[model samples]
Target chain A: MPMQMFMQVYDEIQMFLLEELELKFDMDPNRVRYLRKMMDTTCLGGKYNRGLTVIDVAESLLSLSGARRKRVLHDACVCGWMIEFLQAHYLVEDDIMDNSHPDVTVQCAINDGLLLKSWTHMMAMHFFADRPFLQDLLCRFNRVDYTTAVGQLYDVTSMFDSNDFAEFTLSNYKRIVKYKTAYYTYLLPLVMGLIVSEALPTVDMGVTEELAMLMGEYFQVQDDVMDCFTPPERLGKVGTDIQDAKCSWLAVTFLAKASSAQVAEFKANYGSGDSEKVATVRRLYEEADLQGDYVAYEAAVAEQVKELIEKLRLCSPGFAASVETLWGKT
Target chain B: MPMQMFMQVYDEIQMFLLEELELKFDMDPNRVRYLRKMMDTTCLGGKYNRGLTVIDVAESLLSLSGARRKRVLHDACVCGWMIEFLQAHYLVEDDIMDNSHPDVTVQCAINDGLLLKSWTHMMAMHFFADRPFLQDLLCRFNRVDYTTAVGQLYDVTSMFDSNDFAEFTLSNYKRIVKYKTAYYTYLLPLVMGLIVSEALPTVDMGVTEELAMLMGEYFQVQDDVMDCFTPPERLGKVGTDIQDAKCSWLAVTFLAKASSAQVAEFKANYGSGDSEKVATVRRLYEEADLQGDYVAYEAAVAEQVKELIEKLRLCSPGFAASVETLWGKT
Candidate 1:
């Protein structure tokens, strides 16, 4: 039932965004129509794990029932949708940066991305203007937005340095994951729920942030593994991390473990679009027993995160449940 | 002397932004170096008329002298640089959208544009967080950012419809100019100063907005004229409106006045990279007496804005002086 309610909030916010474009800003109908399609294409297709986390976390933290609970849920949904908007904004621009989408021109996509970002701020201001913590909330969004952009900068620069195998260090990988993937993906949603539930003051933010970074690194590593190991049908798209020579977790980890000769071989085969070259790199990964290494890494991260959550649970069980929900899904 | 002080603020804010990138966010030094260069290239070369307007307006409104004046001037400079940051953000992305700059790849430029935007917000929060009008100030920035993006959308989509001469309506040109150029260039700086000096509550915003829009239109029309008539040596760049088929004021007015035969001929010569075609279009603009038309239009708008300012002067003379400063520059 809560999931159904969360789904309903998406429609409301989408309509609200469209209405503001049309009525408040007096944007042209044709332009508004184009944006509507753009929003649907980019914003709605995701599994919404990031957005829904806001509601789930809020629900776990808040002990209200009846109308007070309903009000809080509604507010949480709004916050949830704001995260969705933020994610959509980044993804739209990221697609352009990566040259992923073909349906829209890069020029139009850039403008649409900007529009999504503007709407995120506008929506936040609209819904939370009366709240005492509006400035704090906005600062959080601002900081994360900047942090993510910096992560993107690191991510893009790393690709340029791909030819130099020395650049693919684990620390660099963790930095990228923490800034790009962790801050917005995990910390933002968790904190938004905390702020909304009035639980932020009582909770230990240092522990929450640590948990977020760990979970974010774990999530990205899982994603890197899935890209290499998952079937195309199951993944819904073909993964090109190897051919694209992305600074992926597998590549970073493999480079650390491989010998000088194997590193030379990887330099030859990795990042090549040639089918045989890609397959050879995949074989190299297999030869290095990366799958087994990943299983061990995943277990150790899970155990560590579980221990962190246990410490977190002693201070606030509700907040721990929220972390558990996200960890369970991953 | 005020200009000298204003120039000093530029260095201060630039240092603050870069320091945040390095110290606060813990961004890589190389990346910060890239952004510093990017900021210099994109933000500093401009005449900074928009940025300076904030200081000009704030000075006019505030009667303080000595230490208090210095403090207000510093704050005004911060706001002024924030406008510069906002402008730089738009221009960097606009350059990519227009395919103007060939030095940096589109991917890097997009990321750089995003970084500039993030810094604008970060700088705003850092400087204005304690001010009671922080929300209002940010809302102004948010609204104008969105408006400019929509204006860009209108500008871009009109280009796609360039083959259809019918789309080059004067009304459309005004809409594009009002949203794209006027709001950010004129209204934003005016209000930023008003807020900084605490003059906003006393000033009549409707008159201020109308004057800003009018001045913006006049300024853009002047730009269109110069783009056609000014030599490349003076303009510092070659004008490509004819070849680019931009929905410029000259083109829109020329289409409105030309006969059907002339209109057909105009369409043929417009939007072509060929030297002959561009020259022919320039001749068509001359044949239509667009320069004389612009002179008369400029005079009329100037008279109208001057009259509106007289009314604004009644309530807030200092604010009116600020408006006059900007008008004097035009």
Candidate 2:
């Protein structure tokens, strides 16, 4: 029921922003239409986990009922959508950089990314202009946005030397994941929920952040594993980390424990677009049982995060419950 | 004298942002270095006219002396640099979309542009956090930013049909210039100056916006003229409006007035990368005496803007004087 309610907010926000583009800014009808299509293409189709996390956390933190509870839920939904918007903006840019999208021109995609980013702030202003925490919320959004770019900077630079597996250490991967994935994907949603519920002051940010980073790092590792091991239909896309020579979790873990002959094979087959070469690399990953290694790694991270959440619970039970709910699903 | 003072603020803002990148965000030293270099390459080397206009307008509006004047000037400079940052962000992205920058990879350039945008907000928060109009200033920046992207969208979409001269009209060109150039270059600086000096309340936004659009349209027309006529050394870069098939002022105006055979010639010769074809288009432009038309257009616009300035002077003399100073130089 709550999921359906949260899903409804997306339409409301879309309508509000589209209306602003037309009525407030007087953007041309055609341009507005283009933007609408862009938003639908890039912003929707996500699992809604990040956006829904804001609502889930807010609902847990606030005990208000009836009309007052509904108002807070609405606010929480806006914050959740803001996170979605942020993710969508990053994806648009990432798609451009990676040459992923075929339907849109790179030039237009670049502007579409800018429009998505601009709308993030506009949505903030629309929803939170009268709220006391407007500046705080905005600054947090800006900070996370910059941090994600820095993470992307790391990701892009690391890929420059595709053959240099020495650079693909677990430590390096963790750093990238923390900056690139952790802050925006995990920390932002949690903190935004806290702020919306007026429960941030009572929560321990140190515990919250640590848990977020743990959860985020685990999520990305699972993503990397899925990219390699899952079927294209199951994963929603074909896995290309092996052929792309990404510094992924499986690659780094296997490299750390791989024999010299395996390293040679990896060096030869990885990053090649040839089907046989990619198949060889994928076979190497399977031969080494990186999936088993991932299962162990996932368990350890989950345990660690649960411990952190327990500490978080002592200070803020509602926040802990929200984190717990998310942990189970993620 | 004030230009030197304005120039000094650039270093201050750069140091602050770099320090934050290193200290607050803990960005890798090498990435920080890359960003510093990107900022220098894209943000600097401009005329600084747009940035300095903020200071000039603020100075005229608020006739303070000693410490107060110096402080106000410093704030104005920060605002000025924010404009530069905004422009730099646009340029870096534009360079990617236009394939202009050869030195940087498009992926890196895309991130660099996003970083520049992030810093614009960071700089705003740093300087205007305590100011009463911080939100107003930020919202204005956001509005102008989105408007510029819309303008760029128009520019890019119009060029999709290179040989379709029907779309190349003065009205469309004016719309593009107003959204893309006028909002950021003319209106933003003027409005930012007014907001900084607490003079926005006294000035008529209707008059200010009208003057800004007029001045901006005129300024862009001159730029279009210079692109074709000015030497590469004088203009800083070779103009490619003809070969790039931009919906430029010259192209539109020429299309509007040229004879049928001339139109045929224009159609065949324009938007060609071959040097001879470009030269022919250039020659066609010359044979039409567009330079003479530009001269007449310049004088008429000058007279029209001066009349608007007089109307502005009645309400806000200081603001009027600031516009007057900029008009003389621009």
Candidate 3:
């Protein structure tokens, strides 16, 4: 059902690009051709969990059937595509900012930024114009985007300037995670879905936000674990977390537990592509037992999510089911 | 009065960065300091004509005094700084996109875009939260940004792909100018000023938009002309139109007047920084009496602006005076 919603939304976005926007440009065939290529490579390439969640939550909350379900699915899908576009906007800019080899197809930075900004605004105009909480939606989205941007700036500045191992504290790590990871990745989609379902006024958002953020934090730590542990073939991409000088979960955990000499060693061998140097950091992570720590961390987050989901289930059965499927118990 | 308004807006923006956002970061003193540095470099660097116009138009329309005018001035300045921040947002990304020397400081492409996007939304929240036309303002701003971005893409794509010299038509040049230069530069400030002035319901916006766009076209053509004709000392920056393979007014005019061989010569010598090639193109422009054509073009635009200003004076003498100071006859 989520896939069905995704497909319909995907088709609608394609139609928007090909028909509406192209006609706006006087059917500049070149415009659609180029944007189509970009959409396939960048937007459509993501795992799309963030987008699918909107539909997932919408299905659970709205609980419509047949034609009415399809109609709501249409609206939910538009919101889903909005999430996809928002993510694409960040990824493209992040790629450029980090000076990585750009993998996803996109536009130049300014044009790219304006394009994404316009896309989000235009999408909101089309889908949420008549909605009661249009201003609220805009405000919430703005807060997430701004919070995310601030987190990015914080991370980049720290990486560039703060080589001091002392600066990498658990509190600092939590700050970055909250600002950078939690809001946009978790809180936004759940909120957006609830709003689209017209269930926002009735719902206690505090519980939902807590659950979403718990999952977001867990999701990021899992990424940190998988980066070093998963093999390149299975991972699909070589983990560059070590080489990128990222202030990752494992790094912060290691520094928190390590002695001063071990901190000195981490400072030396942490952010290198060299196999031996990477191995040195990996060895430290093992000695620090980050894998064990992660398992515990994962279990704790899952517990929190479970409690929140149970709370949500009283009123939001469909939303709870969707949450349980992905973030719920085995 | 306008200067006083700009100063107050500038101060409020500073307060926003220092007080509100810094607290959001849990009082991280660093972000504020770093952003302040950037604000000085990029945001405060410009002539700020766009920002000033908001104050000018507000002063013209509102005609309030004492604390009431200051209150309205504060709102107008917030609108002005929104323009400033928006300009800074694009400038930062554009500088990076063009791969030129970074000057007039700004933000990363998408992150930067989100910054502007969030800035506008936040500004509207602060100043126009309860206003009837708040949604209209957001929609209008979004359209202008989208139109401007589309224009940028068109200009860049043509430069990269169209070497045939056939695509350089008057209509094509107009398309680029209208999209790339007109909306953001001319229309946004005028429209924003009108919105802030609460004149949207009373004013004839078609006439206002036409006048604004007319001046925008005139302003861009003048830049194109000055790039070729003005001395480096007077120009403040070296002209790169020929080197950039730009669809400039002179380029379109040349193609319009040139013989077949002249077109061939024009194609060969364009887009090189070499003095010899530069001189060759300059020679062609002179041979076609382009400077004379430019003077005629100038006179025609001046006449149009004069008539429009007279019409505006009927309703908005302050706006008419501001327009006169900038675009009037000697």
Candidate 4:
């Protein structure tokens, strides 16, 4: 329920927009007009789902006077929306790194408002700082970023780090997931709100941090399974995770058990950035029965997540509901 | 007072070695060890000034009990440290973008402990999440990050977008610093503790936000000046802010008045990364009035800052001190 810029009072938003573009450009009539147009396209382009999810949870938790709660959600949603917006910033950098084509939904970094898109994330960070004590959450937020960066570094390093897939262990896979997806996506929105809510009294966050990390790990595994076996229709598109020499579920599974020829095929075709070639690589994975093992492992990991939730439920019934919602179950 | 792994700490600090080399044995374990040692040597090495500055300001402002205040400062220091850390991350990436020197900092993207260095930021960030009402602070914190990232993207694009520094303007330079330096380093730590202290509720924050922006910009301009002109004895080493073509004060001033020959000479030499060639480039700058202008402009900018502070003292006297102490007295 954050004040949608689309609906906010024009003058009020104008004041902020002027200040946001640094209030330096707005002095000239010509520059103001240009700035406003650019601002409109950039601010309103995002869907704000990731941010909205955080607010929905916050609303269910903080019992505000109807108006007061709306205000809180408005702010949280803005932050969440900002997170989603920032995700685009990272994703653009990532797209360049992975050389994966940006899908139809997202714009390319160069063709559109590249610098605006990039600097807007920082602008959003400054915008968020206008909210008091909100700066405290920055430390946690940056950690997620730093961790994800590390994950990607590990991923690229792992390409040649392990000469044989059999040498790649579950531990290395866990390390990558922990730094990459787990910290950035799953842990970010959750931990951020806790700091904002005044629930977190220190950097040593409690149950929420633990739960998010675990759920994120399981979530990453689910993504791994989907990437290897799930069809593009179910998955929305073919995953680049495999062909990119990604240390994913299927890769690790094949390493654990594949014949030498299949291993040779993975090594040869990996990181080639060709869909047809990667598909052939997937065929080699099937020849090694990686898909079957992946599905089985996914189920086991999901069950482990379930047990963790059951324990949380037994400990604090209130937190149990919130935690369960993350899993999109019960 | 944060748990900084100080230079003294290395006296007995333990190194928990991970199995990175088990995969790539061809890489000398000694080389990887050197990479890690360099990270510890180069990454953690810095002014601890930015990080400590936050703690100094926040502890004075937030009168929590001894134990509690210590904890908050610890977290603030973490946020402060991260700004420094992320700047390095930016520098490393920028080296690649500017094609300046692939081998400059050991903290480059290709560095062995690049990820660890990155995760260190997250670890620092988590220190903030442990505080109270952090959930509310989430959005603000994220906006700060988004803005900073976008600023970086803007910087990269500006470099590539313009073949040289012709398109660079005072506004563009200011925008970059505002996003990159001011918001993260100055505004963040103070606002974080204010949220922690619940002080934001009682005062007008918009004015305070403007103050931080200006203060941060001034600080960075000084930093730029230090790089370009501060004596080695005063600034640790003769800095390279301009020699590195960092959209600096000297370039901003020179571009505003330089003759066509000067601009051409700049294109030929500014970003070349040769100390001897740069000394030659410095000769051209000396020929122009760039040095005199920096001194005059710094004085004028300082005067404006003084006027603004006097005004703040007349009004929001309570808001002025913590951040002001770190300012170079006009």
What residue runs in model 4 are displaced by over 4 Å at the alpha carbon?
A1-18, A23-49, A62-68, A99-136, A190-222, A225-238, A260-280, A301-310, A314-326, B1-6, B9-35, B44-87, B100-330
Q: Can you give the TM-score per candidate against the true fold?
A: 0.93, 0.91, 0.90, 0.59
Question: Per-residue alpha-carbon lDDT of model 2 for A21-59, expressed as tens digits?
Answer: 788665667767777888998888889899999999889
Model 2 residue B316 lDDT score: 84
lDDT of 2: 0.82
> Each candidate: what lDDT?
0.81, 0.82, 0.73, 0.56
lDDT of 4 by residue, B1-330 (tens): 244533332222213222333242223354456546645654465566555555555565575227766565555555455545555554454433333201213223434334434434434334444556555565565466555655554554454431156547888777777777777776776676566555666444666666666777777767776776567898887576545466776677777688887788776887656877677667777888676876777777767666666665555454466556656531
Q: Which candidate model has the greater lDDT, 3 or 4?
A: 3
**Chain A TM-score across all models, in listed order:** 0.92, 0.91, 0.86, 0.75
Best by TM-score: 1
Worst 10 residues of 4 chain A by lDDT: A99-108
lDDT of 1 by residue, A1-330 (tens): 767897788778778888987896667777777788888887787888888898998898776317657866888888888888778887776566556311227767777787888878777778777877677887888788888888877776675631166568988888889889888789998998888887888788989989988898889999998898788999977888887787899999899899999989999998777889988999899999999989898888888899999888888889998899998887
Cα RMSD (Å) between model 3 and the true structure?
3.8
Q: What is the TM-score of chain A in candidate 2?
A: 0.91
> Each prediction's DockQ?
0.45, 0.41, 0.37, 0.13
> Model 1: clashing residue pairs?
none
Clashing pairs in 3: A60-A318, B42-B105
How do the residues B179-280 of candidate 1 rate in per-residue lDDT, one tens digit apiece? Answer: 888887899989888888876779888888899789989999989888887999999788877877888999989988999999899988888888998899
Per-residue error (Å), model 3, residue A213 = 2.5
